[PDB]
Design a protein around this ligand. Structure first.
Ligand SMILES: NC(N)=NCCCC(=O)C(=O)O
Ligand SMILES: NC(N)=NCCCC(=O)C(=O)O
Ligand SMILES: [Mg+2]
Ligand SMILES: [Mg+2]
Ligand SMILES: [Mg+2]
Ligand SMILES: [Mg+2]
Ligand code: NA
Ligand code: NA
Ligand code: NA
Ligand code: NA
Ligand code: NA
Ligand code: NA
Lengths: 340, 340
């Protein structure tokens, strides 16, 4: 086995990073990251008393993270290194892809078998995580499209709202807005009620435990002038089919003829060689397309969505992609539509 | 968010590799890797018929692996690239750390809480995976120590045998040996019975579904002259304590006074700054030490093991580390012992 060790260190580099990604996810999810930001330096004993943890297990996680350069160790205790501090904006990606979809990727081997069904996910962490990401890409994109509409937003409806971050950010920036969010996952719904309460927006924002299609079939007198469907239609498309998506969009404009619809979707370019060599396409969109083949969701192309909108009796006001400072792939597309 | 995308691509690089490590694990575990070696080129339809898989899910995994350069796509179908072919020797590491311990690392957040207990593992994949690794490190080390003993091996006992690879390799190379293996995990035990049958060694090798301590307490007339305890004592140490390890070793030499013991253990240097900067220490030993803090296992230092052996009434014939061509960390140590 001459020279085997050097080949082994490169050969298992994905395993080294696999354990690191899980450990970074727990550092955020358990509140240890925010505790280390607050305390600056914290001994295992102090962190255990504050979060109700066991010393020997916490010291093991801290020693592991110190060896990887995420933490520093002084006589007073452990602290986040400069590299560890720099992880702070990316929390949403770890919570969504590790917390939400680790079980989904681990189920791929068994779900490949004929008739084994769709892989499950932790929809609470998917909702919380994707909402954390939307602060950088989907919320600024929704704002740009809202500004180009022929009317001002007063009553906003967000279906598939996750933990309610889109509504929290839009309501703080636009104090006149009255909003209603709906989230089908119970864990995500409870996170949304808590985030709205924490931000002091319960008097202006209501949250319902409901799916997008059943919300439109339910009875209510609220008359929204804007509806946000952020990464919701591809779930309906996979679960119920294309005629169900067309009928869902027809029901929105039948019930609310003057509404403005803002739809955000990911253009499926999984088999586009050039698009998949972009650094962000390889880091995020390649595993995103993979998880969509194993779950009851279906991503389609930009032209396929425009065809669906035409069939549902909608007219396109404009369409845009995200800022090239956060995501320059051109794969995240936002559409502003009205009744034709 | 000026320049955010470039920071994001580096910030979520551990997530990109996390999904890749899981996908590489399934490529081996589902038999798709061996199918691609055998066929050279295979369309999704051919691979689905042979392994009983669904076309749309398999095409998704193949497109994902093509974008990462693990597979090539021609008009005839998909094939392993040169980089994909080069993964073949490392199967055991993926099966052990991803198949065996992915759930363990994912449970860290919940198991950190006071009184939450030890993290579980898939002991079948741990056994199968570690046995695949032993072909490179622990089996050649056991051979070197066996050659330095004052007697020849005729009757071998392997406690914690996994899928039985140590016994299969030693029996093929030394046709006079009669061997007995014991594995406590039922899945691993069934894999061992099948591997022994597949190799044509059932007439010379027996396998029992049993733990190491309960095997020595059970009744049998087999008189081994060699006993291999490969990464077994640190499980007993964590589960039952130091006096139980000492009593277990005393019972081996009380029952078999002329036996030769070959013990393989990992030296705990988790807090040794210099040792942890070795490329293999960071890739393998850093997550190995972390998983030992969350499971009912305890790794100790080389000197701590020598103290245990002296207390149990044992004399050290010699001790060695692995070949520097496969593992030059000096952390894997093999001990050859006899009754004092
Ligand atoms: N951040 C981007 N691009 N959107 C992803 C939203 C979540 C999603 O679609 C899923 O988890 O299925
Ligand atoms: N390959 C090496 N170094 N041995 C590890 C054996 C497995 C093990 O100890 C565990 O999974 O707990
Ligand atoms: Mg949404
Ligand atoms: Mg989706
Ligand atoms: Mg063993
Ligand atoms: Mg062990
Ligand atoms: Na959940
Ligand atoms: Na990728
Ligand atoms: Na799907
Ligand atoms: Na198992
Ligand atoms: Na590491
Ligand atoms: Na332990």
């Amino acid at each position: 086995n001459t020279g085997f060790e050097t080949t082994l260190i490169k050969g298992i580099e994905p395993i080294r990073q696999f354990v690191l990604a899980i450990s970074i996810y727990h550092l955020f999810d358990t509140k240890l990251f925010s505790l280390l930001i607050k305390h600056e330096v914290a001994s295992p004993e102090v962190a255990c008393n504050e979060l109700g943890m066991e010393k020997e297990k916490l010291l093991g996680l801290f020693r592991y993270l110190k060896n990887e350069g995420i933490l520093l160790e002084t006589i007073d205790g452990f602290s986040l290194s400069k590299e560890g501090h720099a992880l702070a904006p990316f929390e949403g990606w770890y919570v969504m892809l590790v917390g939400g979809y680790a079980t989904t990727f681990l189920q791929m081997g068994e779900r490949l078998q004929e008739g084994a069904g769709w892989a499950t996910r932790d929809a609470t962490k998917v909702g919380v995580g994707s909402c954390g990401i939307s602060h950088f890409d989907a919320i600024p994109l929704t704002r740009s499209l809202m500004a180009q509409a022929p009317g001002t937003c007063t009553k906003l409806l967000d279906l598939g709202c996750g933990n309610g971050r889109y509504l929290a950010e839009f309501c703080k920036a636009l104090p006149q807005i009255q909003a209603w969010g709906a989230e089908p996952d119970r864990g995500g719904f409870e996170e949304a009620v808590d985030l709205i309460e924490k931000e002091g927006l319960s008097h202006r924002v209501h949250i319902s435990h409901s799916g997008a299609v059943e919300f439109l079939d339910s009875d209510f007198d609220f008359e929204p002038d804007f509806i946000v469907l952020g990464f919701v239609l591809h779930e309906i498309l996979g679960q119920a089919g294309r005629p169900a998506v067309v009928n869902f969009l027809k029901k929105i404009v039948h019930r609310f003829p003057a509404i403005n619809l803002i739809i955000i979707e990911v253009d499926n370019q999984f088999d586009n060689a050039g698009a998949m060599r972009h650094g962000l396409a390889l880091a995020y969109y390649n595993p995103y397309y993979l998880l969509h083949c194993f779950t009851n969701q279906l991503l389609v192309q930009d032209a396929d969505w425009l065809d669906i909108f035409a069939e549902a009796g909608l007219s396109l006001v404009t369409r845009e992609t995200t800022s090239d400072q956060v995501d320059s792939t051109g794969l995240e597309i936002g559409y502003l539509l009205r009744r034709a």
